[PDB]
From Swiss-Prot, chains A, D:
Origin: domain of life: Viruses
Induction: Expressed in the late phase of the viral replicative cycle.
Protein function: Major capsid protein that self-associates to form 240 hexon trimers, each in the shape of a hexagon, building most of the pseudo T=25 capsid. Assembled into trimeric units with the help of the chaperone shutoff protein. Transported by pre-protein VI to the nucleus where it associates with other structural proteins to form an empty capsid. Might be involved, through its interaction with host dyneins, in the intracellular microtubule-dependent transport of incoming viral capsid to the nucleus.
Lineage: Viruses, Varidnaviria, Bamfordvirae, Preplasmiviricota, Tectiliviricetes
Name of the protein described by the UniProt record: Hexon protein
Oligomeric form and interacting partners: Homotrimer. Interacts with the capsid vertex protein; this interaction binds the peripentonal hexons to the neighboring penton base. Interacts with the hexon-linking protein; this interaction tethers the hexons surrounding the penton to those situated in the central plate of the facet. Interacts with the hexon-interlacing protein; this interaction lashes the hexons together. Interacts with host dyneins DYNC1LI1 and DYNC1I2; this interaction might be involved in intracellular microtubule-dependent transport of incoming viral capsid.
Swiss-Prot record, chain B:
Organism of this sequence: Human adenovirus C serotype 5 (HAdV-5)
Induction of expression: Expressed in the late phase of the viral replicative cycle.
Modification sites for Phosphoserine: S112
Record text on subunit structure and interactions: Interacts with the peripentonal hexons as well as the hexons in the facets. Part of a complex composed of the core-capsid bridging protein, the endosome lysis protein VI and the hexon-linking protein VIII; these interactions bridge the virus core to the capsid.
Family: Belongs to the adenoviridae hexon-linking protein family.
Keywords annotated in UniProt: Capsid protein, Host nucleus, Late protein, Phosphoprotein, Virion
Cystine pairs: none
Residues forming coiled coils: none
Name of protein: Pre-hexon-linking protein VIII
Note from the entry: All late proteins expressed from the major late promoter are produced by alternative splicing and alternative polyadenylation of the same gene giving rise to non-overlapping ORFs. A leader sequence is present in the N-terminus of all these mRNAs and is recognized by the viral shutoff protein to provide expression although conventional translation via ribosome scanning from the cap has been shut off in the host cell.
An annotated Gene Ontology molecular function: hexon binding
From Swiss-Prot, chain E:
Free-text comment on this protein's domains from its UniProt entry: N-terminal amphipathic alpha-helix domain is essential for the membrane lytic activity. Late-budding domains (L domains) are short sequence motifs essential for viral particle release. They can occur individually or in close proximity within structural proteins. They interacts with sorting cellular proteins of the multivesicular body (MVB) pathway. Most of these proteins are class E vacuolar protein sorting factors belonging to ESCRT-I, ESCRT-II or ESCRT-III complexes. Minor capsid protein 6 contains one L domain: a PPXY motif which binds to the WW domains of HECT (homologous to E6-AP C-terminus) E3 ubiquitin ligases, like NEDD4.
Annotated positions for site Cleavage: G28, A29
Stated name of the protein: Pre-protein VI
Family, per entry: Belongs to the adenoviridae protein VI family.
Portion of the full-length sequence here: 6 to 40 of 250
Native source species: Human adenovirus C serotype 5 (HAdV-5)
Taxon lineage: Viruses, Varidnaviria, Bamfordvirae, Preplasmiviricota, Tectiliviricetes
Length: 50, 165, 78, 50, 35
């Protein structure tokens, strides 16, 4: 009955893992040699990265 | 290294202007055979020679219901339904059937630009045109005979663009 | 496909505006016309009221909508 | 006639304004896209500012 | 041609052909610049 006003705090804990952002056109794991990694754009030309 | 089987040079793109920036030897895909004997070393040299042959050659040789714009649209000229027009007497309420006039609407929708462009190059054409270039005997000429396109800080008209102004 | 009929007619001749007028403006290098041209401790009364009248109205040179006024000379404040 | 010795102070005020340091060769406004903006060194490389 | 014009150069100083004019209070104006 005498409950006080309140807010909500949300967080997630993930331990023991690595975030992964695969270099694929649709993020799927279709092979060891990712399809976008052999695309002509990123195979012949050289690009900077930020 | 060797002036006959050289590691290729790979161009760098500048997306923003559309021109091609300076290039450089490929430095991310080298093979480290420094722990191999003459057999595998000759094999690897032959492989790099094969790669160079592939590059040179490639470069040199290889350089009703109109679709509208992805969703087809039908086309009618005499589809005029509401033949009335409001003269002094009539009073036409809400109406309107959107129909593309064959000549006026469609042609006006698919005209190109007024005058074609003259400037930089898009991404696809850059990929098709600027393959990695194999430089056989590097810098073997007198000064001024070198390929200046390779240096990114070099401007074609005004030579040797001073960085930092 | 000619849109001249849509324009106001200045007499047997459509009033086609200059094609070189499509907007472009940024922070520096872009300037537009019509600039910001403009219990009395002091009882003068006169010039005061006159000045207030001046304050509420206007004058410049590219205000050439319609006519400049009779005999002429070409002047500044461009 | 009996004025005392004096020392001058100078200061200036500039409100409703922003100082500007254009990135152009001669500081002029020769266009929106300054030539230094198109200077090939600033266009085909990376740099750090301090 | 006309020789009766101020000459600011060897070439004469002549305005636009289309110079003759009108305005009615109306708003039959409220029209744009000389430019």
């Amino acid at each position: 009955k005498t409950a006080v006003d309140s807010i909500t705090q949300k967080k997630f804990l993930c331990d023991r893992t690595l975030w992964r952002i695969p270099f694929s056109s649709n993020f799927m794991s279709m092979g060891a040699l990712t399809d976008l990694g052999q695309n002509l754009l990123y195979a012949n030309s050289a690009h900077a990265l930020d | 290294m060797s002036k006959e089987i050289p590691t290729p040079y790979m161009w760098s793109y500048q997306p923003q202007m559309g021109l091609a920036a300076g290039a450089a030897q490929d430095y991310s895909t080298r093979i480290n055979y420094m722990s191999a004997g003459p057999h595998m070393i000759s094999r690897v040299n032959g492989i790099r020679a094969h790669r160079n042959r592939i590059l040179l050659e490639q470069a040199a040789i290889t350089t009703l219901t109109i679709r509208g714009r992805g969703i087809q649209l039908n086309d009618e000229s005499v589809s005029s339904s509401l033949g009335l027009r409001p003269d002094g007497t009539f009073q036409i309420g809400g109406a309107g059937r959107p129909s593309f006039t064959p000549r006026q609407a469609i042609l006006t929708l698919q005209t190109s630009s007024s005058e074609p462009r003259s400037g930089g190059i898009g991404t696809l054409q850059f990929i098709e045109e600027f393959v990695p270039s194999v430089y056989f005997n590097p810098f073997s000429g007198p000064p001024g005979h070198y390929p200046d396109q390779f240096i990114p800080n070099f401007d074609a008209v005004k030579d040797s663009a001073d960085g930092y102004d | 496909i000619n849109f001249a009929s849509l324009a106001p007619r200045h007499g047997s001749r459509p009033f086609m505006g200059n094609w070189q007028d499509i907007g472009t403006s940024n922070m520096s290098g872009g300037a537009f016309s019509w600039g910001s041209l403009w219990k009395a401790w002091n009882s003068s009364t006169g010039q005061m009221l006159r000045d207030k009248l001046k304050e509420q109205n206007f004058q410049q040179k590219v205000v050439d909508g319609l006519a400049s006024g009779i005999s002429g000379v070409v002047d500044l404040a461009n």
